């Protein structure tokens, strides 16, 4: 694994052993939305700033957004150790680890136009059957690359890919060369 994945797995194990899992995931989404917007990330980095000031402003930004107590201790430990400069990647891989532990698996469907909810739920049935995940989450992205249908980027991270799309004519012309 990576260090970010290790910290994310720690936070996910906490969200397991304490019954605050979905609240923890929502709080991590809030926290990564926070630790975007470069000024605050640069503030929590740049170790010349005193650790006391850093943890005090951390306490304030916790009591502002009202995070879960345990994830507040998590980001506080991240500040305590010198591995706070990884916090964006950690909160990013938390989605991976949370979904893997909870049993949900992400399926990215890319279609030329917005995909309707009924057929999206049918694609969810398909991805759920081929993978074996409980509450498969389909985050769709409208892309102009294709021509007619959809690509499914389900799997660990992008790895598996099934598609009825511009890849059809692509394979057609490519194996039409056949040289």
């Amino acid at each position: 694994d990576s260090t970010a994945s290790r910290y994310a797995s720690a936070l996910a194990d906490v969200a397991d052993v304490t019954g605050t899992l979905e609240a923890t995931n929502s709080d991590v989404e809030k926290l990564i939305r926070i630790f975007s917007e470069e000024p605050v990330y640069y503030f929590f980095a740049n170790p010349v700033i005193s650790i006391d000031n850093k943890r005090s402003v951390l306490d304030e930004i916790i009591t502002t957004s009202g995070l879960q107590p345990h994830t507040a201790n998590f980001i506080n430990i991240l500040i305590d150790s010198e591995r706070i400069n990884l916090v964006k990647e950690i909160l990013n891989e938390f989605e991976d680890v949370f979904n893997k532990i909870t049993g949900t698996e992400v399926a990215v469907v890319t279609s030329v136009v917005k995909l309707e909810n009924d057929h999206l739920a049918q694609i969810a049935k398909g991805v759920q059957k081929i993978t074996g995940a409980k509450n498969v989450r389909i985050k769709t992205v409208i892309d102009p690359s294709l021509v007619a249908g959809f690509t499914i980027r389900y799997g660990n991270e992008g790895s598996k890919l099934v598609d009825m799309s511009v890849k059809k004519q692509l394979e057609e012309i490519a194996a039409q060369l056949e040289m």
């Binding site: 917007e37 000024p39 605050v40 503030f43 740049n46 010349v48 700033i49 000031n53 402003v57």
Partner: protein
């Protein structure tokens, strides 16, 4: 997000402006020989920096966050 936290944001930008000075930065680590200063996104390679105690030094290593 960070809507009502405008006072916290003013605090963090104040602390940044306290630590983020133009052509100025702390010495993170000063080993035997080299010193590893932080900041100084204005300097070029080989720029004689001053250490405010009477010892100039050249900057041969412009890494990402710390200038060696």
């Amino acid at each position: 997000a960070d809507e009502i936290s405008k006072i916290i944001r003013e605090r963090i930008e104040g602390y940044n402006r306290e630590v983020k000075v133009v052509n100025t930065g702390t010495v993170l680590q000063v080993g035997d020989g080299i010193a590893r200063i932080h900041g100084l996104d204005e300097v070029m390679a080989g720029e004689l920096v001053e250490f405010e105690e009477g010892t100039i030094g050249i900057a041969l290593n412009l890494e990402s966050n710390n200038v060696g």
